[PDB]
Structures are given as structure tokens and as C-alpha cells.
Design a binder for this molecule. Structure first.
Ligand SMILES: Nc1ncnc2c1ncn2[C@@H]1O[C@H](COP(=O)(O)OP(=O)(O)O)[C@@H](O)[C@H]1O
Ligand SMILES: Nc1ncnc2c1ncn2[C@@H]1O[C@H](COP(=O)(O)OP(=O)(O)O)[C@@H](O)[C@H]1O
Lengths: 249, 244
């Protein structure tokens, strides 16, 4: 009766970044909520937010590579980015453990490959054993090697992970905790008449997310998008007591 | 042409605080030495030192489970230990990266399994790829799921890692950077008459290297606490210690 839950990198990281930083209050609270609901089976994915975007964008990870001088620089940037995202994960696991959750991380760059930006290989047997042993596996948006020889590496997002693993683990619920209430007709931060959709079916950042999810819903698994920045929402979603959000179908 | 280098947990960490902590001076120095040597193909293993043993010990990981209280507990500890040793590795990578070294961790507990405390399976195709793209895979001592149902989790040490991967990748040289000058005839730390051996843990450490010795590969023990040994060994130059 398993649940897969994504924590958007925007909810748990802070952008007013001298350096990358946790949103400690959002993080410790969400952990508390995961503890209070105590799901029977759980897997978590989290976005990188300020520990990821800034570095991978600086180095253009996932973009064609023109010359050997590009290449040498990007190879360094892949490594620097992977360490930054690992440090966020270690904060993540700190907060979970602090709440008694046996969070076990699985670094995507150590067992996942991409081809042209799409997950090409992911071992799922180890994740399954962690789940079987009663642990909480935690994956996260990360940089991975890309067998497309123009690219060499890609960023695999929290959202591709949620899609790839929910397809294959066939969880009962897929919950995406984001920093807005749901999907809207329009970017509700640029458009005053954006309306909150309670369910989605086609196209009618956050677009990226929906495209990914629409692949998943089309294979018969539905997800829910809720605001994690709103107290209790994670705890209620994990309890199965409907919350404000959008279902993708 | 490749070299696998271990950095012993005692060398890079210090037992010395309520909190685990790095030996910042050894670690940045060692990073700088690896930087200066610029080996053309390298992989690093490192020990967990004080980020590892304390938690593993508290929870008795890799010893037999009686009770479901025992069980539930060892679970929590597996998770706690893996996080602590991940934070160390993140320090190790910071230090490598500060030297311009494209070091990429590969968390063992994300692709390696054990059986009865021994390394059972590990895909080595991502490691190869990382080496092919000129990066420096960094693995480390960690807790791994163990398919012996009596144990469930084992600590797989940096020594087992160096033995397991050297056999499968067949590196040019293997170099173990420890906190003493070599293997002695006895524990130098409480036998004033222990004599350095120039050719042949270390009850354990040696046990493992012997397996490897036997199957055709020979390693070198050196003191990585001493300035320049790592750099000199990385460059192929005479350095004091023991051949195996
Ligand atoms: N149609 C939309 N509905 C909801 N939010 C949208 C939409 N279009 C753009 N957005 C923006 O997308 C953001 C959420 O996506 P993102 O920053 O990737 O979240 P996460 O950190 O959860 O991945 C929202 O903060 C919002 O500003
Ligand atoms: N016969 C021996 N020769 C050398 N050192 C020994 C011997 N027996 C015990 N030791 C102890 O083992 C220590 C190094 O072992 P180990 O903890 O495996 O190092 P690392 O942290 O580099 O893996 C030495 O500092 C020494 O105190």
C-alpha cells in the first residue's frame, strides 16, 4: 500500500542565497508531518532547488557540447553540481532521521543513466529491497551520465524520477508537494485570472512537471499536486484526507 | 594506466569532538598532493573513520539480529550511519573539487550488496563510464544491505572495496594511504620493537590485500599523514612503506 511523495526543491530550499540554503522551517515541519502520518510504505523524491539549478545552469548541463575546452569545464561542473545536490540530500535525511524515519538515500548518479535527457537505465531491485526491509528510500534530482555523445550528461529531475519509479513500483498514491496550491490555467504569479484546476487531462518549471506527469497518467497512474508550503497538507495527504490540489488523470 | 588510491579514515578524520569531524589539514593537503600529481586515471576509496565506526558500533551493524526490537533499531541505525558517512564523503569531494579535480562520489549503499559481510554484487559499468569521461569516482566505507537474513546489514569497509574493485578493473597500481609508515612485524603503537616490513587493519587490512596478492595484483602501503608521500607515490617515485 505504498506512497511516493516528491518535495519540490522550491519548498525546501531558499533562493535568497548567499550560498545554497535549506528552508529549515519548511523542511523540519514537513518531516514532522511525515512522522505524524507514519505511512506503511514510503518513498521520497526531492528537487534540488538552489542546490541544483544555479550550478547546472551555470555549466549548461544537458546541452550540446561544442569543444574539448567546453568539455573539460562541464566535467568539473557535473562533479560540483553532484556534490551540492548530495549536501542538500544529507540535510534532507537529517531532518527525516531527527523524526525517527529510517530515510535511506540513493544517489541517482550512482545507479541511473540517461540517454538524451531521458532515464535510459535505473536498477530498481535495490530500491525494492530497501522497501521490503521497511526503509524509506530517498532519491533526488541529480546530474547523470548521458549516453548521447553530444550531451555526455543531463539533469534528471525530481519529476522524471517520480514518473519513472511510479510507473515501475506501481504505488497506490503519487503526491507532489509544491509551493503553489495546484496547477492553474495560467502562471498564477503572472496572471490574475489564473484559475486552480481540480483535475487535469491535457495541456489546457510547472509545465515541465505536468508533461512528465501526463506521461504517467497516460500509463494508468494518477498523481496529486498539493502545496507543501501549507501546514498539515503533507500530513493530511499522507493520511488520505483530501487536501486542496489538482489530480492528473 | 589507472590507479586506485585509499585514504584511511584515521588519516582524514579525527576522533576529537562530541561531533564527528574532519582532519581538515590532512585532507586539504592530500587533495593538493593529488592535484599536483595529476594522475591521468584515478579512483579513490576512503574510510569513514570517526563518521563511521561510532554509529555502526552503537547499533552493532553486521552482527546477528535476535529481536524485532533489534531489527527496527538496526534499521534506524543503518540510515543514520549512511547519512554520516555521506557527509564525510561530501567533505572529501569539497576538498578535491577545491583543487579542480572532477571527483564524483558513488555511494556504495546505492549500488552494492553484501552477503554475510562480504561484497556480493556490484555493477561496475557506471564506474567505467566515469573513468572513461576522465572523472574520479570516489567510493567509501558504508553500510550495505546484506542478503544473509541473520544480519540484514553489514558495514563494507574501504579495504573490502579496494580488494573488490582492483580485481575487476585490474588497475596499474593500488596505493593505500594509512596513518603509519608501513606494515610492521607487530602493532607499532604498543610494541616498541615492531620492525617495518619492506615487502610481504592490519589484522584485517592485510588479510584482504592477500586475497588480491594471490589473484595477481600487488598493493602498496604508505603513510599519508606525512607530507608528500601521496604525491610522490602518485607520481611513481620512491616512497617509504610496504609492498604486498
Ligand atoms: N499553470 C501553472 N499553475 C501553477 N503554477 C505555475 C503554472 N505555471 C507556472 N507556474 C509556476 O511554477 C512553480 C512551481 O514549479 P517549480 O518551481 O518547478 O516547483 P517545484 O519546486 O515543486 O518543482 C510555481 O511556483 C508557479 O510560479
Ligand atoms: N602489524 C601492524 N603493522 C602496522 N600497524 C598495525 C599493525 N597492527 C595493528 N596496527 C594498527 O593499525 C593501524 C592502521 O590500520 P587501519 O585502521 O586499517 O588504517 P586506515 O584508517 O588507514 O584503514 C596502525 O595505526 C596501527 O596502530
Amino acid at each position: 500500500h505504498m506512497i511516493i511523495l516528491k518535495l519540490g526543491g522550491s519548498v525546501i530550499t531558499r533562493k535568497d542565497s548567499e550560498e545554497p540554503a535549506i528552508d529549515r522551517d519548511n523542511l523540519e515541519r514537513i518531516a514532522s508531518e511525515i512522522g505524524n502520518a507514519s505511512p506503511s510504505s514510503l518513498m521520497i523524491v526531492h528537487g534540488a532547488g538552489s542546490f541544483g539549478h544555479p550550478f547546472a545552469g551555470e555549466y549548461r548541463i544537458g546541452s550540446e557540447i561544442e569543444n574539448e575546452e567546453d568539455l573539460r569545464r562541464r566535467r568539473f561542473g557535473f562533479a560540483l553540481t553532484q556534490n551540492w545536490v548530495k549536501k542538500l540530500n544529507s540535510h534532507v535525511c537529517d531532518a527525516l532521521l531527527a523524526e525517527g524515519i529510517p530515510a535511506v538515500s540513493m544517489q541517482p548518479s550512482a545507479f541511473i543513466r540517461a540517454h538524451a535527457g531521458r532515464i535510459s537505465h535505473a536498477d530498481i531491485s535495490l530500491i525494492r529491497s530497501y522497501l521490503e526491509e521497511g526503509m524509506v528510500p530517498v532519491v533526488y534530482g541529480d546530474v547523470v551520465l548521458d549516453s548521447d555523445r553530444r550531451l555526455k550528461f543531463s539533469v534528471i529531475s525530481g519529476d522524471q524520477l517520480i514518473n519513472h519509479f511510479s510507473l515501475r513500483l506501481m504505488p497506490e498514491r503519487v503526491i507532489l508537494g509544491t509551493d503553489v496550491d495546484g496547477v492553474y490555467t495560467r502562471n498564477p504569479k503572472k496572471h490574475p485570472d489564473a484559475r486552480l484546476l481540480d483535475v487535469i487531462g491535457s495541456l489546457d518549471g510547472m509545465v515541465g512537471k505536468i508533461r512528465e506527469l501526463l506521461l504517467l497518467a497516460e500509463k494508468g497512474v494518477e498523481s496529486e499536486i498539493i502545496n507543501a508550503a501549507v501546514p498539515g497538507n503533507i500530513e493530511r495527504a499522507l493520511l488520505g484526507e483530501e487536501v486542496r490540489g489538482t489530480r492528473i488523470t
